[PDB]
Amino acid sequence: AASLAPGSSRVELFKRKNSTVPFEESNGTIRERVVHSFRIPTIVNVDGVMVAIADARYETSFDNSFIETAVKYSVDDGATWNTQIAIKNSRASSVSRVMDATVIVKGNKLYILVGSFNKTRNSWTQHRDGSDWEPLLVVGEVTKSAANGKTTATISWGKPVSLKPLFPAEFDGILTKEFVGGVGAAIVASNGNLVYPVQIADMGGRVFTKIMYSEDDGNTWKFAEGRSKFGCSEPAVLEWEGKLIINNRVDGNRRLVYESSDMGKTWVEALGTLSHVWTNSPTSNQQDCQSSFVAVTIEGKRVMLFTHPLNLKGRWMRDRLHLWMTDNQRIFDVGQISIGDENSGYSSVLYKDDKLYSLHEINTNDVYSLVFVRLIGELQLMKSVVRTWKEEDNHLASICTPVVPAGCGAAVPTAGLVGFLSHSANGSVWEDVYRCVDANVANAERVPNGLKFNGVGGGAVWPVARQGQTRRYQFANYRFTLVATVTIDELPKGTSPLLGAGLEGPGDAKLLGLSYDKNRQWRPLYGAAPASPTGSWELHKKYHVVLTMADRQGSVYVDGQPLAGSGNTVVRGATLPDISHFYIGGPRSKGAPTDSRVTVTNVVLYNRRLNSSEIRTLFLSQDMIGTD
Ligand SMILES: CC(=O)N[C@H]1[C@H]([C@H](O)[C@H](O)CO)O[C@@](O)(C(=O)O)C[C@@H]1O
């Protein structure tokens, strides 16, 4: 949906120039005080109690002003609320402030890390030194009580402790200046470790991200050895199948993501999954924004939730806030969660007692409020999509395949299965069985498990780069596997396209693919190398086709065996290829009036290089996988 889903609603929880907070004067007296703006939100669940954390910007929305950390907690899922001032600032001057809260929840305790400043009027990365800054850690404890029927709760906040004395003066050569958390909800690793994603500023004004953790519930803190590239900020982390996943903000470029199997010791870019998928705007050269990255279990399946504005207006406007769901294989757009073309910003998401909630910013004239939202309709959609992934995966994993001369043979591979095109298809659309990325069609006629092509441009386009702003099939450039069952219906005049991957840019170059000619021979394409024909085929016969691409290599299989040339390098340079799209048949909106008279059924796409036996399994069972 392009707007807050029907059946969903929200309230202006933190209302600008209206809501008051229990401010404490120097002498101890407490007076309710108006607040210009409320920014940088985070909502979490502590032992059944909702806790909303945010910046209370008293006089103005600017970063350099009087700020304190406000809090609003609840025990009745948002019916009633209580308000406190979690952390005070130093009171050293008109601009003293504490900001950018990062939060971790373990047991009934809250661990809050923030940046504290005294007098500076310029931004942190641009300070002369670090004399004005301090990294503060605050611990909060939640206690539940109860009168007759009605439950109540209190929250006690301890005295702030500084981590400065633990900040090394240098990292592998690099001279340090300041550091803060990455903002947002953090985690408690399965081994019990408290894991903080942090952003570091060096002396020379550069920025990068790193991991800061504790094995002893807050006593000590260690800094992992690994790190990101320069330019990464406001990072968010979660735990997935044994590894840590780090999702960074990147002003003026696409978002970088890394993996780590050793609590941060070594980092590898996630080129085969999520890296470079999300960005800051259509052109990717605008200011970026914060994002939430949280792991949850829906209908018995562990998945990942990601948020981020589209920013169609550019700069700091941050409009049209979306929500994504991924299983580290497929990536689904749950729609827009903000209203119309309003201005949003930072955000937060929480799954509690089978209900979905959100806390985010709304901006008008640079005065900020914080809305509390109920994702009634979004969760519905989400629950449906998971049931599909679950159902299809198991189905494919239950088929009894032939036994190979050495009950059943090897199972049909589902690990790394990203997309599937089969029987279902309507209008100019070929439907994605996994409900994420459909393929555009032209000049086709439906057949069991696929389509038959006839006419100028007959074919299908599976969008890669052509997806636009968000590039969900970015993994293809690093590695991929394409599968398909085919038949050739009519003899071509010379050479004709059947299936492959094409590149952005001049001419109509291909990365890898397969073509057929007038002599009944296959014509494989391996990068820019001339396509010399080989082998032999017959009209109307069903053939298994497979395309492999890994380690910059390429291979093409027919009937389970490789064709001559298979194993050759397909791209020179350290620069990644830029796949425009996958092509099935011979689609085209311009140029040569291609008319590939072929029929294609059951196209499968994986995010990894399938092994030899896995290809055998597919070749011997292609008659059992179709969706009828
Ligand atoms: C400490 C601090 O000022 N953080 C602020 C960041 C910093 O500019 C980046 O960290 C620069 O690296 O940007 C903001 O202005 C923003 O984009 O909304 C808000 C946030 O409060």
Side-chain angles (χ1 to χ4, degrees), residues 1-25 27-125 127 129-158 160-169 171-393 395-537 539-541 543-627:
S3 184
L4 184 53
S8 292
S9 45
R10 77 178 185 188
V11 307
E12 198 171 338
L13 184 51
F14 293 85
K15 201 144 154 70
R16 59 199 155 197
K17 291 184 184 180
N18 198 280
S19 312
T20 56
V21 287
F23 173 76
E24 178 181 358
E25 307 273 11
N27 69 21
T29 168
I30 301 183
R31 120 226 190 211
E32 294 287 310
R33 172 180 185 170
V34 200
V35 175
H36 183 305
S37 299
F38 291 101
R39 292 202 62 206
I40 333 296
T42 296
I43 188 177
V44 305
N45 156 51
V46 183
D47 200 342
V49 170
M50 284 186 175
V51 190
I53 302 90
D55 275 13
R57 305 191 171 191
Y58 296 92
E59 299 292 306
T60 161
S61 57
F62 288 128
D63 295 0
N64 305 259
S65 45
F66 206 55
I67 306 180
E68 283 189 336
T69 309
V71 155
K72 279 190 186 292
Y73 68 72
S74 169
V75 294
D76 46 47
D77 296 315
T80 67
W81 289 94
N82 268 6
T83 303
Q84 330 162 263
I85 291 294
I87 312 162
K88 308 156 45 193
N89 65 217
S90 60
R91 304 285 173 102
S93 87
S94 41
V95 286
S96 297
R97 62 195 179 271
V98 283
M99 56 202 293
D100 304 317
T102 311
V103 191
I104 300 188
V105 174
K106 185 171 189 180
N108 71 326
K109 291 176 175 181
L110 289 143
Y111 295 86
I112 300 189
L113 161 72
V114 305
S116 190
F117 306 84
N118 294 334
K119 316 189 180 186
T120 52
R121 294 183 178 261
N122 59 333
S123 54
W124 84 299
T125 66
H127 292 343
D129 57 47
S131 59
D132 196 45
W133 155 94
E134 281 194 335
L136 305 182
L137 175 69
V138 170
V139 173
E141 196 166 354
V142 179
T143 305
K144 276 191 297 183
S145 77
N148 37 211
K150 266 78 97 297
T151 304
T152 57
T154 52
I155 304 197
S156 182
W157 302 97
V161 173
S162 178
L163 309 177
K164 204 169 191 181
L166 307 186
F167 198 42
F171 282 124
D172 193 29
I174 314 165
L175 303 173
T176 63
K177 186 156 74 180
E178 312 183 355
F179 92 74
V180 176
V183 177
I187 73 172
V188 171
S190 66
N191 74 11
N193 291 11
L194 303 190
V195 182
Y196 264 138
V198 296
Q199 27 180 184
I200 319 262
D202 75 4
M203 286 301 276
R206 288 175 314 187
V207 169
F208 61 91
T209 61
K210 222 172 206 298
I211 304 274
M212 189 184 73
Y213 65 107
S214 171
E215 301 161 332
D216 62 22
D217 283 332
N219 263 77
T220 54
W221 296 96
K222 317 219 205 95
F223 280 80
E225 309 189 329
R227 73 161 171 107
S228 70
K229 262 148 146 279
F230 293 99
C232 302
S233 70
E234 283 179 349
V237 67
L238 63 77
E239 172 161 57
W240 181 268
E241 281 176 27
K243 316 157 144 72
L244 292 181
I245 306 187
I246 328 192
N247 190 325
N248 305 257
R249 162 176 176 176
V250 179
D251 288 331
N253 220 159
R254 307 188 76 75
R255 299 181 66 104
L256 292 160
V257 184
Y258 301 76
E259 292 186 325
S260 174
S261 329
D262 43 25
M263 199 54 55
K265 184 152 170 274
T266 158
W267 298 24
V268 175
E269 193 180 346
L271 302 172
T273 32
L274 306 172
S275 205
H276 268 216
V277 166
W278 294 292
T279 183
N280 61 246
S281 58
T283 58
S284 298
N285 69 337
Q286 302 297 299
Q287 181 182 323
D288 192 5
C289 186
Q290 175 273 351
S291 293
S292 46
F293 203 35
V294 165
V296 308
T297 298
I298 298 174
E299 215 96 307
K301 190 178 190 63
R302 205 77 170 145
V303 290
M304 289 174 282
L305 295 178
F306 178 84
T307 51
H308 204 312
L310 289 184
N311 195 29
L312 284 182
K313 300 175 180 185
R315 307 200 281 156
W316 75 91
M317 313 297 275
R318 297 155 175 176
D319 59 285
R320 297 186 167 86
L321 169 63
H322 268 252
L323 162 71
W324 290 261
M325 178 181 64
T326 183
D327 72 342
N328 214 247
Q329 313 185 118
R330 305 98 187 197
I331 311 182
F332 184 96
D333 189 2
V334 191
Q336 180 171 315
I337 66 187
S338 64
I339 313 191
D341 63 329
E342 67 181 332
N343 297 355
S344 64
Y346 286 41
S347 58
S348 185
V349 284
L350 161 66
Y351 188 44
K352 176 179 179 295
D353 301 321
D354 204 15
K355 286 207 168 71
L356 196 60
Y357 304 100
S358 179
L359 215 207
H360 67 77
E361 290 175 331
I362 62 172
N363 171 189
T364 305
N365 280 317
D366 303 350
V367 196
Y368 301 57
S369 274
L370 290 187
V371 295
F372 182 44
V373 189
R374 302 179 189 268
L375 295 180
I376 297 284
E378 273 85 27
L379 191 61
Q380 189 178 68
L381 181 58
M382 287 158 61
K383 289 206 178 192
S384 176
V385 171
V386 176
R387 282 198 290 269
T388 289
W389 296 350
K390 270 179 55 184
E391 284 170 14
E392 191 64 45
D393 272 15
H395 165 76
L396 284 177
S398 292
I399 301 174
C400 195
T401 70
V403 194
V404 197
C408 300
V412 177
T414 55
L417 217 157
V418 167
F420 195 12
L421 304 176
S422 198
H423 185 85
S424 212
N426 69 46
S428 41
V429 177
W430 198 349
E431 294 185 296
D432 178 7
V433 168
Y434 284 82
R435 295 166 72 183
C436 287
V437 188
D438 291 331
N440 304 299
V441 180
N443 272 326
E445 166 197 316
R446 297 185 67 206
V447 307
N449 302 313
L451 305 160
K452 164 166 165 168
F453 302 113
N454 190 310
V456 171
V461 173
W462 218 352
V464 178
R466 290 181 182 186
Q467 275 179 42
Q469 179 153 356
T470 307
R471 309 192 167 194
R472 288 172 284 173
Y473 285 169
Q474 177 73 15
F475 64 83
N477 302 300
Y478 184 49
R479 59 187 187 202
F480 77 76
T481 299
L482 196 54
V483 185
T485 282
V486 308
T487 81
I488 292 176
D489 304 325
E490 287 178 273
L491 280 157
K493 174 174 172 60
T495 300
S496 212
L498 170 65
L499 173 91
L503 309 166
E504 290 267 303
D508 94 307
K510 289 90 183 287
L511 174 61
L512 176 72
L514 177 55
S515 211
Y516 64 112
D517 66 29
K518 55 167 279 199
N519 300 324
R520 299 202 271 103
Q521 293 201 273
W522 305 107
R523 282 208 194 223
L525 327 164
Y526 309 91
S532 56
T534 171
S536 177
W537 55 264
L539 274 178
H540 302 119
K541 192 161 165 56
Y543 290 105
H544 199 68
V545 190
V546 172
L547 303 181
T548 215
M549 201 294 288
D551 299 314
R552 295 165 48 235
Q553 272 160 2
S555 298
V556 179
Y557 299 74
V558 179
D559 280 345
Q561 305 297 314
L563 300 188
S566 298
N568 273 9
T569 270
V570 299
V571 56
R572 267 90 160 196
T575 308
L576 272 181
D578 192 4
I579 294 164
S580 57
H581 66 286
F582 283 128
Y583 62 93
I584 301 158
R588 50 67 87 216
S589 59
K590 61 200 164 197
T594 303
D595 202 338
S596 263
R597 293 307 177 90
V598 303
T599 295
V600 185
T601 58
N602 298 133
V603 175
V604 198
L605 164 73
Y606 298 81
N607 69 10
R608 57 174 187 97
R609 202 282 179 199
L610 283 179
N611 70 48
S612 81
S613 67
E614 286 174 316
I615 304 183
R616 175 159 57 196
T617 305
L618 282 172
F619 162 54
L620 292 164
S621 65
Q622 66 186 144
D623 278 352
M624 310 162 168
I625 57 163
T627 58

